[PDB]
Amino acid sequence: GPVPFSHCLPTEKLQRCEKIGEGVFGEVFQTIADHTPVAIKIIAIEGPDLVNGSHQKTFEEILPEIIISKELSLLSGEVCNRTEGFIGLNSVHCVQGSYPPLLLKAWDHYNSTKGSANDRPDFFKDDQLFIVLEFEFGGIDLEQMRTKLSSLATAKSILHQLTASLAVAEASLRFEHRDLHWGNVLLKKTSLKKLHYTLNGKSSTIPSCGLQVSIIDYTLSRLERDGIVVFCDVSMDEDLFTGDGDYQFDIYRLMKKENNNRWGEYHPYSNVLWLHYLTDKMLKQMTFKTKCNTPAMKQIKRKIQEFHRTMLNFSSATDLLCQHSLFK
């Protein structure tokens, strides 16, 4: 059956919770257990109350995110198709109860300093169900790092980490992220110079430039094992395809064109679209502490422009990884 919040967040862990993120879906908290930071994603399910102005998902509607989080976490421990480029999933729990007052306290501090688009989650009764996803702490998203990266050299490492991770997932799981906006790319300092991946049994390395990328948030994602497909059917969604003000909202339209509004099919070009969006973000909205002033740097800049100009003529992240000149 379900367990109380205390099962997931004993006193200690609860008292150390800071809010780090939010969406229509719910709330993300940072905390510490065994000296180790973790992120807690908390989602209300099965209830009749609107939350942040939308209906709660049923268990059946939240399953696909649970399944896909697990599958992509497991790639860190595989052999033929191995990557750490997704986020480690420590645990999943179904929780019953009102929202812990100590989580409300973390929620209020966030609302005060940063401000929130969400309802104060203080209106839940003691029968309310939540899914609690605990992740390894993956760092801070690429959006919030807009002005924080050192040079375009770092950009190349990020795009390489992202392409390799998506390629490994393509080969293993026929995976599409389908919502890889720069909010869903996390960066973390690493003292490792090379990062390792295996694709179809063949191991290579990517220079880190002191960063480790983690792809998050599998709420729109798709994959399959033994011809069983797990996905979010957005065939009948309206709002997803009517956004503007950012290349992001074009990718929703361009995905729907590629797959003729059939979201069960495998179209790995969706990964190429998102990688083009991210490459576009690197050149147009990221600003670096050190511009390209030396000759070897202006080369890296030209190769990323060339990437941006060409990558849409590749059929998958796999095709990019193995055929694009940026990665030779």
Judged by CB under 6 A, does residue 216 bind ligand 07C? yes
Among 8, 9, 17, 20, binds ligand 07C (CB under 6 A): 20
Q: Residue 21 or residue 64: which is nearer to ligand 07C going by CB? A: 21
d(CA 276, CA 273): 5
Q: Residue 223 or residue 311: which is nearer to ligand 07C going by CB? A: 223
Judged by CB under 6 A, does residue 21 bind ligand 07C? yes
Q: Is 23 annotated as a binding residue?
A: yes
Q: What are phi and psi of 244, to 5 degrees?
A: -150, 180
Q: Which DSSP symbol is given to 175?
A: -
- With contact defined as beta carbons under 8 Å apart, do 138 and 87 qualify? yes
Judged by CB under 6 A, does residue 217 bind ligand 07C? yes
DSSP helix/strand/coil, 5: helix
Tokens read off for 253: 């339209």
Spatial CB neighbours of 59, under 8 Å, sequence gap ≥ 6: 45, 46, 129
Catalytic residue among 119, 179, 237, 280: 179
d(CA 228, CA 226): 6
CB of 42 to ligand 07C, least distance (A): 10
Active site residue 250: no
DSSP helix/strand/coil, 275: helix
Among 64, 100, 138, 268, binds ligand 07C (CB under 6 A): 138
Q: Residue 39 or residue 171: which is nearer to ligand 07C going by CB? A: 39
CB of 139 to ligand 07C, least distance (A): 7
Judged by CB under 6 A, does residue 41 bind ligand 07C? yes
Q: Is 138 annotated as a binding residue?
A: yes
Judged by CB under 6 A, does residue 185 bind ligand 07C? no
Q: Residue 39 or residue 152: which is nearer to ligand 07C going by CB? A: 39
107-136 residues in contact with ligand 07C (CB under 6 A) are 135
Judged by CB under 6 A, does residue 254 bind ligand 07C? no
CA distance to 189, 191, 197, 207, 208, per residue, from 204 (Å):
21, 18, 6, 10, 13
Binding mask 67-106 for ligand 07C (x = CB under 6 A): --------------------x-------------------
Question: DSSP secondary structure string, 207-239?
Answer: E-TTEEEEE---SS-BEEETTEEE----TT-SG
Burial class for 107, CB neighbours closer than 10 Å (0-12, 13-18, 19+): buried
CA distance to 27, 98, 104, 271, per residue, from 121 (Å):
9, 9, 7, 34
Q: How many residues bind ligand 07C (CB under 6 A)?
A: 13
Catalytic residue ranges: 179
Q: Please state the residue numbers annotated as binding site.
A: 20-28, 41, 136-141, 179-184, 217-219
Binding site for ligand 07C (CB under 6 A): 20-21, 23, 28, 39, 41, 87, 135, 137-138, 186, 216-217
